[PDB]
C-alpha cells in the first residue's frame, strides 16, 4: 500500500486494454479509496496478532479498509454447456426458487449459482467453484476500479390478480452491471 501511492507505471492492467498494448501509462492511489479483500480468518489474525501485538499503532492500523467474508466462495461457475436430465436435480432447483427450469433446458457458461449445488450428477465435472486454493488471499484495490450499476426504476411490477383461482401474483425485476476497470492499481497476494 506504500507502493501503490507513488508515481509509477506499474500495478495497473493498462496493458490488457485496447490501445495500451505498446505504451506506458502511470497512475497513483490516494488511500482514501483503497480497500483490501481477504477472508475473515485473515482479518481475525491481524486483529488478533498484528495490531494487537505490535506496541505502536499510532496511525499504523489499516483495518478500516478490510472487507471480510466467512469464505470467498459459495458461488459455482458453469463449464461445458449441457442439458439437464434428472427430475431430482430440477425439484432440487425448485427448493431455491427456480420455477422455470424443466427437462428441456440447457445451461450456458454465462451463469452462476451462488449456492452449493455441485453434488448433483448433472453438475459434477461441468460446474466448478470460485475459491483461492491457498486461502492466504489478499486482493487490494481502490474503489474507483470496481463499478456497480444497479437499476431499480421499475422496481415493483403491478400485481396480477387472477380471481378465478383467487390468487394474486407479484414480480420483482432489477438490473445490475457489476464490472471492474483495469485502469487502476491492483495487487493480488496468494501462495499460488
Amino acid at each position: 500500500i506504500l507502493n501503490l501511492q507513488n508515481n509509477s507505471a506499474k500495478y495497473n492492467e493498462v496493458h490488457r486494454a485496447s490501445g495500451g498494448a505498446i505504451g506506458q501509462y502511470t497512475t497513483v492511489s490516494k488511500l482514501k479509496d483503497i480497500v483490501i479483500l481477504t477472508t475473515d480468518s485473515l482479518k481475525s489474525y491481524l486483529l488478533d496478532t498484528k495490531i494487537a501485538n505490535t506496541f505502536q499503532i499510532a496511525g499504523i492500523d489499516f483495518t478500516d479498509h478490510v472487507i471480510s467474508f466467512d469464505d470467498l466462495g459459495g458461488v459455482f461457475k458453469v463449464t461445458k454447456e449441457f442439458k439437464l436430465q434428472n427430475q431430482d436435480s430440477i425439484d432440487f432447483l425448485r427448493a431455491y426458487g427456480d420455477y422455470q427450469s424443466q427437462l428441456g433446458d440447457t445451461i450456458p457458461v454465462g451463469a452462476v449459482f451462488t449456492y452449493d449445488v455441485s453434488k448433483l450428477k448433472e453438475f459434477t465435472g461441468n460446474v466448478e467453484e470460485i475459491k483461492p486454493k491457498s486461502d492466504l488471499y489478499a486482493f487490494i484495490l481502490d474503489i474507483n476500479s470496481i463499478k456497480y450499476k444497479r437499476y431499480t426504476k421499475g422496481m415493483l411490477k403491478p400485481p396480477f390478480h387472477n380471481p378465478e383461482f383467487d390468487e394474486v401474483t407479484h414480480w420483482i425485476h432489477y438490473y445490475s452491471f457489476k464490472a471492474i476497470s483495469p485502469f487502476f492499481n491492483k495487487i493480488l497476494i496468494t501462495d499460488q
Binding site: 486483529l47 483495518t63 472487507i67 471480510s68
Partner: peptide, 30 residues
C-alpha cells in the same frame, strides 16, 4: 437496498473491553 448497516454497525469485534457480563438481551418479537 441496505437499510440496517452491515460492516459498520455490524462486522465489529473492535468494540468490547469491559470486565463485565450481560449482553444477554432477549428482545421482544413481532
Amino acid at each position: 437496498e441496505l437499510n440496517e448497516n452491515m460492516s459498520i454497525d455490524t462486522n465489529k469485534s473492535e468494540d468490547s473491553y469491559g470486565v463485565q457480563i450481560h449482553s444477554l438481551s432477549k428482545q421482544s418479537f413481532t
